[PDB]
Design a protein around this ligand. Structure first.
Ligand SMILES: O=C1C=C2C[C@]3(O)COc4c(ccc(O)c4O)C3=C2C=C1O
Length: 331
């Protein structure tokens, strides 16, 4: 009657064998920096939860980025802080440089290293085959690191991957949806941007894990080598799963549903319809072919799998021959 349970096939117990203080962010005591070290220069963007500014550290005149956190649950604020501290120093993880507070009002803000990024809507149009391989490898380093440290990012998308292209510099940002993995825990499926949501999320399977990030990465990869961003473009969450089924096919989707004994909304049957699995080669045209290779398609095919347990891990992905030239020239 109920859905079959699942656990991560790698890094399953990394929080289990770490001390309580590592993952119990509720108990963490924050060490506050000095708010008056930073001057805001211009608003960079705003979410539902935060507003983000370019700023200057006036003690050394370095650029930073300041994210002022709206009146939300302190628990959510502490989770992001603990995660950023836990991951600090990891490869291509955005550095949390400081945590400050208006000393009179309650209002906390996170201070990050500045990345002089090129906007992905502009950058992706200009990347070469080698650039994509290089940057995908760099994202994989970050994901393997944070997974190995017991953390799911849960919001992997181009806007959260900052690239200073002239310095070949990449940082994975926005850890505000990130969460500690504990085996058997049922997580909120309302995470990730619509276009990067895994099948587990769209069918309301809550016992997911690190492999969610690997789907999102697969979605990014597709959008880059095929020059179609985003690759799966649904108008809502139901339609998002339909866009996926039109490429991956409905037969493998129903096998997935069957294996985990997942109960699908009645709605879904009529709209999912019946679709053959398409060959990846179908999305190759004159304009994107210089970015596509047999290795790329084989790699992509091993990321975009319905069954979260069958997707490559970050370490397996880094071993794929798609990256041979990158690994070779990084040793
Ligand atoms: O949790 C977050 C959230 C953001 C949002 C945002 O502030 C947007 O834009 C940024 C940036 C960081 C550096 C940077 O150079 C930049 O332009 C961002 C973050 C880093 C994080 O860890």
């Amino acid at each position: 009657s109920g859905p079959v349970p699942s656990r991560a096939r790698v890094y399953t117990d990394v929080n289990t064998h770490r001390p309580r203080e590592y993952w119990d962010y509720e108990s963490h005591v924050v060490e506050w920096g000095n708010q008056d070290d930073y001057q805001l220069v211009r608003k960079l963007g705003r979410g539902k939860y935060s507003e983000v500014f370019e700023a200057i550290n006036i003690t050394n005149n370095e650029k930073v980025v300041v994210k002022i956190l709206k009146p939300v649950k302190k628990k959510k604020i502490k989770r992001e802080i603990k995660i950023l501290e836990n991951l600090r120093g990891g490869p291509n993880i955005i550095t949390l440089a400081d945590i400050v507070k208006d000393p009179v009002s309650r209002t906390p803000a996170l201070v990050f290293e500045h990345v002089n990024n090129t906007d992905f809507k502009q950058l992706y149009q200009t990347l070469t085959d080698y650039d994509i391989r290089f940057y995908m490898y760099e994202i994989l380093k970050a994901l393997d690191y944070c997974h190995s440290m017991g953390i799911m990012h849960r919001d992997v998308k181009p806007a959260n991957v900052m690239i200073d292209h002239e310095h070949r510099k990449l940082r994975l940002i926005d850890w505000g949806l990130a969460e500690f993995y504990h085996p058997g825990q049922e997580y909120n499926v309302r995470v990730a941007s619509r276009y990067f949501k895994g099948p587990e999320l769209l069918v309301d399977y809550q016992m997911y894990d690190y492999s969610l990030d690997m789907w999102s990465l697969g979605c990014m990869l597709a959008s880059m080598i095929f020059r179609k961003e985003p690759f799966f473009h649904g108008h809502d969450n139901y339609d998002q799963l339909v866009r996926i089924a039109k490429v991956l096919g409905t037969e493998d989707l129903y096998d997935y549903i069957d294996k985990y004994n997942i109960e699908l909304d009645p709605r879904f049957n009529d709209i999912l319809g019946r679709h053959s699995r398409k060959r990846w080669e179908r999305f190759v045209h004159s304009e994107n072919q210089h970015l596509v290779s047999p290795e790329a398609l084989d790699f992509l095919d091993k990321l975009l799998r319905y069954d979260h347990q069958s997707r490559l891990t970050a370490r397996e992905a880094m071993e794929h021959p798609y990256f041979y030239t990158v690994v070779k020239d990084q040793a």
